[PDB]
Amino acid sequence: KRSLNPDEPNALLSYDFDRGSNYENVLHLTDALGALVPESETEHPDQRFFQVTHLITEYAWVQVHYELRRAIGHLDEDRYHQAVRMFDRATGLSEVTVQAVRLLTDHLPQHSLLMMRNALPEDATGLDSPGYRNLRRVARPVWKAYEQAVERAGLSLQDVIAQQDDGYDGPRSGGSQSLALVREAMLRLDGSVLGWKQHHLIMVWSQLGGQPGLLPQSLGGRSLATLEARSQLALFPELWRAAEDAYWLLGTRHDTDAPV
Amino acid sequence: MKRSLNPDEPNALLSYDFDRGSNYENVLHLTDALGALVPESETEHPDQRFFQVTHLITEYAWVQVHYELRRAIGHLDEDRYHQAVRMFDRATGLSEVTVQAVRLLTDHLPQHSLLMMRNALPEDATGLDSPGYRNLRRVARPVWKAYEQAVERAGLSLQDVIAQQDDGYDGPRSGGSQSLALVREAMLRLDGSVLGWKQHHLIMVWSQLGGQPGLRELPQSLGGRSLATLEARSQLALFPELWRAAEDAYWLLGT
Amino acid sequence: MKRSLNPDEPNALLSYDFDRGSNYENVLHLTDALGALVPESETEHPDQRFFQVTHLITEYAWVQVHYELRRAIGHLDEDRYHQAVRMFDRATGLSEVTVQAVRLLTDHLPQHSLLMMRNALPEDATGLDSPGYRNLRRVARPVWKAYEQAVERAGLSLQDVIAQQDDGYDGPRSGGSQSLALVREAMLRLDGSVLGWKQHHLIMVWSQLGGQPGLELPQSLGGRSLATLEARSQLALFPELWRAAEDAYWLLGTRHDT
Amino acid sequence: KRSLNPDEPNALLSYDFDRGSNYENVLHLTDALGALVPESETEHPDQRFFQVTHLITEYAWVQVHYELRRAIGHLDEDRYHQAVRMFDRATGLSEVTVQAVRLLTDHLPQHSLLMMRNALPEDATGLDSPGYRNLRRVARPVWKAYEQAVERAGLSLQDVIAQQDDGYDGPRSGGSQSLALVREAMLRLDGSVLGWKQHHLIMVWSQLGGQPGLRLPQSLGGRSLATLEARSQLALFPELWRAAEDAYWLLGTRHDTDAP
Ligand code: HEM
Ligand code: HEM
Ligand code: HEM
Ligand code: HEM
Ligand SMILES: C[C@@H](c1c[nH]c2ccccc12)[C@H](N)C(=O)O
Ligand SMILES: C[C@@H](c1c[nH]c2ccccc12)[C@H](N)C(=O)O
Ligand SMILES: C[C@@H](c1c[nH]c2ccccc12)[C@H](N)C(=O)O
Ligand SMILES: C[C@@H](c1c[nH]c2ccccc12)[C@H](N)C(=O)O
Ligand SMILES: [C-]#N
Ligand SMILES: [C-]#N
Ligand SMILES: [C-]#N
Ligand SMILES: [C-]#N
Structure with a gap:
């Protein structure tokens, strides 16, 4: 139902997630995957x-x-x-x-x-x-x-x-x-x-x-x-x-x- | 100030303190990730x-x-x-x-x-x-x-x-x-x-x-x-x- | 006094020297274990x-x-x-x-x-x-x-x-x-x-x-x-x-x- | 064959080896196993x-x-x-x-x-x-x-x-x-x-x-x-x-x- 990777044209390369499955629900997985830095904000691959x-x-x-x-x-x-x-x-x-x-x-x-480090916050x-x-x-x-x-x-x-x-x-x-x-x-x-x-x-x-x-x-x-x-x-x-x-x-x- | 992941534990030394707003935590979205863990109040098995x-x-x-x-x-x-x-x-x-x-x-x-645990899990999980x-x-x-x-x-x-x-x-x-x-x-x-x-x-x-x-079978x-x-x-x-x-x-x- | 697993080696720094008679070697029987390695003069593949x-x-x-x-x-x-x-x-x-x-x-x-290597190995090894x-x-x-x-x-x-x-x-x-x-x-x-x-x-x-x-x-x-x-x-x-x-x-x- | 623990009398617990198979021949396995300290000489299990x-x-x-x-x-x-x-x-x-x-x-x-160390050679x-x-x-x-x-x-x-x-x-x-x-x-x-x-x-x-x-x-x-x-x-x-x-x-x- 959702994709971490929306602007990817090739649909075989989309990371599809948040399908509301019971496996997903049990693990609070969508919540944990939501902590990843969004692809549109990454400063380095x-x-x-x-x-x-x-x-x-x-x-x-x-x-x-x-x-x-x-x-x-x-x-x-x-x-x-x-x-x-x-x-x-x-x-x-x-x-x-x-x-x-x-x-x-x-x-x-x-x-x-x-x-990456030249741009990180000071006391990280x-x-x-x-x-x-x-x-x-x-x-x-x-x-x-x-x-x-x-x-x-x-x-x-x-x-x-x-x-x-x-x-x-x-x-x-x-x-x-x-x-x-x-x-x-x-x-x-x-x-x-x-x-x-x-x-x-x-x-x-x-x-x-x-x-x-x-x-x-x-x-x-x-x-x-x-x-x-x-x-x-x-x-x-x-x-x-x-x-x-x-x-x-x-x-x-x-x-x-x-x-010896 | 810190938050506790186990805030009903009496002994402070057993408290898992987090969400302190440090840059380490900010850069990693670590507080958000730790928020996926099932709350201690809601666990049904240790x-x-x-x-x-x-x-x-x-x-x-x-x-x-x-x-x-x-x-x-x-x-x-x-x-x-x-x-x-x-x-x-x-x-x-x-x-x-x-x-x-x-x-x-x-x-x-x-x-x-x-x-x-499995006896209480949902079907087709x-x-x-x-x-x-x-x-x-x-x-x-x-x-x-x-x-x-x-x-x-x-x-x-x-x-x-x-x-x-x-x-x-x-x-x-x-x-x-x-x-x-x-x-x-x-x-x-x-x-x-x-x-x-x-x-x-x-x-x-x-x-x-x-x-x-x-x-x-x-x-x-x-x-x-x-x-x-x-x-x-x-x-x-x-x-x-x-x-x-x-x-x-x-x-x-x-x- | 000592042994080498590659004795002909020109460069002495590339020589694997062993069997120096140390107590470490004696306790472990290390020379005998190293003695089981296929000799370099006899290897058929690197x-x-x-x-x-x-x-x-x-x-x-x-x-x-x-x-x-x-x-x-x-x-x-x-x-x-x-x-x-x-x-x-x-x-x-x-x-x-x-x-x-x-x-x-x-x-x-x-x-x-x-x-x-397999093509040269004995039968039923x-x-x-x-x-x-x-x-x-x-x-x-x-x-x-x-x-x-x-x-x-x-x-x-x-x-x-x-x-x-x-x-x-x-x-x-x-x-x-x-x-x-x-x-x-x-x-x-x-x-x-x-x-x-x-x-x-x-x-x-x-x-x-x-x-x-x-x-098949x-x-x-x-x-x-x-x-x-x-x-x-x-x-x-x-x-x-x-x-x-x-x-x-x-x-x-x-x-x-x- | 031959046993690494011959004085073990229960044969199901004998470690049998030196059977002269081509597997053992190719590997020089018998020679390598012969480096093990013999069971009759070990001073600690x-x-x-x-x-x-x-x-x-x-x-x-x-x-x-x-x-x-x-x-x-x-x-x-x-x-x-x-x-x-x-x-x-x-x-x-x-x-x-x-x-x-x-x-x-x-x-x-x-x-x-x-x-074990109390009995070992000096400067080992x-x-x-x-x-x-x-x-x-x-x-x-x-x-x-x-x-x-x-x-x-x-x-x-x-x-x-x-x-x-x-x-x-x-x-x-x-x-x-x-x-x-x-x-x-x-x-x-x-x-x-x-x-x-x-x-x-x-x-x-x-x-x-x-x-x-x-x-x-x-x-x-x-x-x-x-x-x-x-x-x-x-x-x-x-x-x-x-x-x-x-x-x-x-x-x-x-x-x-x-x-x-
Ligand atoms: C999985 C990745 C990492 C983890 C979980 C991690 C975790 C930690 C922890 C727990 C400390 C405090 C340790 C102590 O003081 O005994 C620390 C300190 C430190 N880490 Fe890492 N670290 C990681 C990666 C890195 C990387 C990639 C770098 C640099 C390239 C780095 C550089 C440092 C430095 C320099 C300190 C000392 C901080 C200071 O004294 O101000 N760490 N890290
Ligand atoms: C880190 C833990 C686990 C992970 C990441 C995991 C992941 C997976 C994955 C990817 C599949 C599908 C693989 C395939 O079909 O080839 C699968 C299927 C399955 N897993 Fe797990 N699993 C985990 C733990 C467990 C545990 C603890 C159990 C049972 C005690 C279990 C039982 C099963 C069963 C029975 C299936 C078949 C599902 C079906 O055919 O309906 N798994 N799991
Ligand atoms: C560290 C390396 C290896 C060890 C310790 C090892 C050990 C064993 C053992 C114990 C068996 C009997 C187990 C069984 O058949 O259920 C076996 C069988 C077998 N091994 Fe290996 N093996 C090694 C490497 C290899 C390699 C490199 C190959 C071929 C590329 C290979 C091919 C086979 C085959 C085909 C069998 C079937 C039994 C037969 O030969 O009739 N093994 N191996
Ligand atoms: C798998 C087991 C072991 C291996 C492969 C091994 C290997 C080595 C090596 C290569 C050295 C010299 C390295 C150096 O000093 O920079 C060394 C030194 C040393 N080892 Fe081990 N060692 C093993 C186990 C042990 C054990 C069980 C002990 C004691 C409980 C021990 C205590 C020492 C000491 C004290 C030194 C310093 C020697 C000296 O300065 O006189 N080692 N070991
Ligand atoms: C044990 C159970 C299950 C295994 N891992 C899961 C993760 C989330 C939700 C359920 C599960 C597994 N799928 C099963 O069918 O037995
Ligand atoms: C590179 C930097 C850093 C290393 N790992 C981090 C995780 C989150 C935020 C910053 C960092 C590290 N602490 C440093 O002082 O160099
Ligand atoms: C315990 C001893 C020793 C450790 N590993 C060894 C191997 C063979 C002979 C002796 C040892 C170690 N060298 C020591 O100095 O304590
Ligand atoms: C490759 C060969 C072999 C595999 N491991 C070995 C060890 C010693 C002697 C022969 C082998 C393996 N047993 C085979 O039958 O293909
Ligand atoms: C880690 N810094
Ligand atoms: C896994 N189920
Ligand atoms: C293995 N043979
Ligand atoms: C270590 N000897």
Whole structure:
């Protein structure tokens, strides 16, 4: 009934949509397609690709936030098994954001980006991303819910870390092994998000410069050094602290090795 | 000031704040896009949002596939082969996003959740009405046509274009022919990726509605149709002629 | 002191040097693995090495899949549900590596190269003799049996375990039934990934030997039509999971003639 | 035939191989499987998974090396289209190494790693990886071959970057656009290898510690994890990232003019 592409003479090349189908109705799809910059307003043929990769990312992150909320509810009621599924789903959605920014790295021409950017508004930065800002916000109540669940069960993090190793002989329970799977899914999620940050950094080096082996400024006026420093901020620093803790407590090698 | 996507959640740290009027949000029409999500007050199942978001991600990727394919037609019609290559490769990357979106359902959507949601869904609520799918199928013919006519204007045979992908092939080469070969190769990758989508979507359906063939009446879609019709449409390519040319090469070159 | 895979190479910067006796190399048995590559003096096509390596990578992932599935049997037999989960998830990740490796051929192996190489390959050189695939098919029943037995020892129904994946489900739950539910979900992900390998391998064959069904048939190096490949391609590792999926569709769906 | 696990007494669980089929003959598969540490010698059940992920990686890297040599040959003879394919193939092979290291991040138990690492030889390090040492060594001749091909065509790197943009109106030839496609493929390859380095770093943070947000552990060679992080930012083709930054300075019209 409608077309995103009205002035296209060739009718086989029209993007026909908004047919009022029940599939369309269920998804609020016409509403979501209405957010695309209208073809009559695009300033560069690469503009649509630019916008779509961000919208895909923001949809993935709002869903991450939704499932992390659910995981807080599960942990607060000691429903460990149900918490695991929320974290695994979140990791998968995170991996879509990684794919989406790597689309820019692999296919966004830097010269198109620079042309487009010379005309963008002044403080147009992903520091204002709602997916990113809310993922940072919610990470703290998420860690707290896990930490408190481990406490109620009378375990340490060193315990649940150790029980991932089949050869570890300490006594276990159903609850301790469930909290272990939770920790492992949480670590995979945080690893994925850290991966998003590194791939977005590699993208920036290919579009604006500043590859550290070799500074440019964001539209906010900020050196890329600031982006690069924030790129190593984790969702759950406590988990990475517990990893290093395991190295110090269980490694029996420190300050004894040398080159051969 | 910010708005909340979940404004009846008491704990502010659990609030999804957005619509802050930043230039990032303005340039992307992000607030409008987030407005497509079913309101939290109206969800009937906690997995409904996940359901919706995997579709919306897929449809954004497919409308972008369409946009880039139109560009590929424009290039091919003017013999801009290099520039056409990039459009096909970009489409393949977007298609791979759709594959991971539906595999998100395979890996994480509980069949039991799906069946409960499906019992309340409307009748003939089907992806046969997907704009992404229908318009992709629509545009695939003009796309094959633009590639075929560029090959014809070059006076090349498709068999020759296939052959010179092999470094060991000794026949005549030109910049034009090797360019059209890179276009060919990029086109086959795109179609193969789309055939991957169709199969992963089918594997999903097997895990959610049943009917895995290894088991040798079938379940039915929300429009009353057997899953065997889905399985048959699952092997239809975008560019049949490329798969015929591969078959022709085996017969001409196979000893 | 050292070896080279291309020793005659003029430019020393193009030499692939290995076997330097490092501890890294010693721990991994790397020299022996590199020793399996077709020698450069013996290659008959510049794409031969790509062909070989994609298979060797696949076979390494599948023997690891086998090792971890054996561990999953041992866990399930002792009711170590959580530990079994990890084995299945790991096998799934290893399976996804095999998907990547065959899609490398789809995306980058020229059909014309394949045909030239295929014309010179021995008779009945076929992946029906893949040790990875044969031992995977061997172990698939022992693996399903271990899961089924554990479910029975717990006095649960497969339909119950499926229902427990849904947060909205009101039925009785226990720590053991939800654990067995995470195991079911992990073995389904593995089987869907192996079904994914089969479909991508099929798509690759269509682009290299022909026979895309949307369009008598080509033959493998053993003489068999591609019709038998397509049929074997829908065979799952754990048919009883897919059976349980359809069982639930009839059991829970309320619109089968609506 | 023969079994990889002969002391397994249930024959349905034997991994049978060395059947002398032509499939195995062509592939040298029996020799390659013989590199696996024998089951009777493994000291931890996670040891095989550890070894196999390295072996997959080194197979992928030796194939990257082989195809980059071919790319040098193509470039020295101005066969641009042919070189593009070798770089694209290398990129796919690099992506296999990324998935292999991420298999350790997602599934290798830190506690098993530490147990295993406490018994490993001293200075057993991937600094002695042949895939890694040879890829670093060959990257210089690869870049020189591209650079010389660009010079011979009388082009600048700015020109081939600009020609990736459909809106750029400078004069083009078949050669210049072909050399652009080559550049774009080498950038994807180098970005993929930079991705491997970052995912390998994230893995190391989860196994030995040292995640930089928390602020050190030492390698089996006694070297601080800070040196690994420093080398993590070294590209194959630094000149490509230098030309990206060059484009920012030459073509961006915003520097030192924006602010929050
Ligand atoms: C899918 C596309 C993108 C997404 C989702 C995205 C998201 C983000 C996010 C969340 C941040 C804040 C991250 C942090 O500080 O840790 C950010 C910052 C930044 N992004 Fe992106 N980004 C995208 C594409 C781009 C592109 C194409 C460029 C440039 C070519 C770019 C350049 C930057 C810069 C320079 C910053 C730092 C802002 C500052 O410090 O003022 N990004 N982006
Ligand atoms: C991201 C999620 C999904 C997308 C993008 C999607 C898209 C599509 C498309 C494009 C078709 C038509 C394809 C063809 O006919 O060749 C289709 C059909 C179909 N899909 Fe989906 N789908 C999705 C999820 C699902 C789910 C979760 C189910 C069931 C649990 C499902 C079941 C079906 C069925 C049964 C058909 C056949 C329709 C008929 O023949 O009446 N799909 N879908
Ligand atoms: C990474 C590369 C490959 C791997 C790991 C692999 C593995 C396998 C396996 C396990 C089978 C038995 C599965 C079944 O028949 O259901 C098989 C069969 C088959 N493969 Fe492959 N394969 C690869 C590449 C190829 C290539 C490049 C071709 C031809 C272009 C090919 C053509 C066939 C055919 C025709 C069959 C049918 C069985 C027969 O040969 O009679 N495969 N492959
Ligand atoms: C697939 C598995 C792995 C591969 C292919 C691999 C490869 C490499 C390579 C190529 C290097 C040298 C790169 C550089 O330093 O710039 C390296 C260094 C290093 N790797 Fe790995 N690695 C793997 C797994 C691991 C694991 C499991 C650990 C520890 C838990 C580890 C810890 C380190 C450390 C500490 C270094 C720095 C060595 C030193 O500076 O002495 N790696 N690895
Ligand atoms: C290029 C620009 C930008 C990058 N992605 C954006 C999305 C919407 C609006 C602006 C942007 C980026 N933030 C920069 O500062 O360079
Ligand atoms: C599950 C159902 C459906 C699947 N995806 C949808 C999206 C919007 C509306 C309905 C659906 C699918 N079409 C079916 O026939 O089963
Ligand atoms: C091409 C050929 C073959 C495919 N993969 C192989 C590995 C080793 C030896 C031979 C092969 C394949 N089995 C065929 O029958 O066509
Ligand atoms: C754990 C260890 C190691 C990591 N990967 C290896 C492969 C072979 C031999 C040793 C290793 C690593 N090099 C370290 O220094 O911690
Ligand atoms: C992003 N900016
Ligand atoms: C989809 N239906
Ligand atoms: C495979 N053969
Ligand atoms: C790594 N060694």
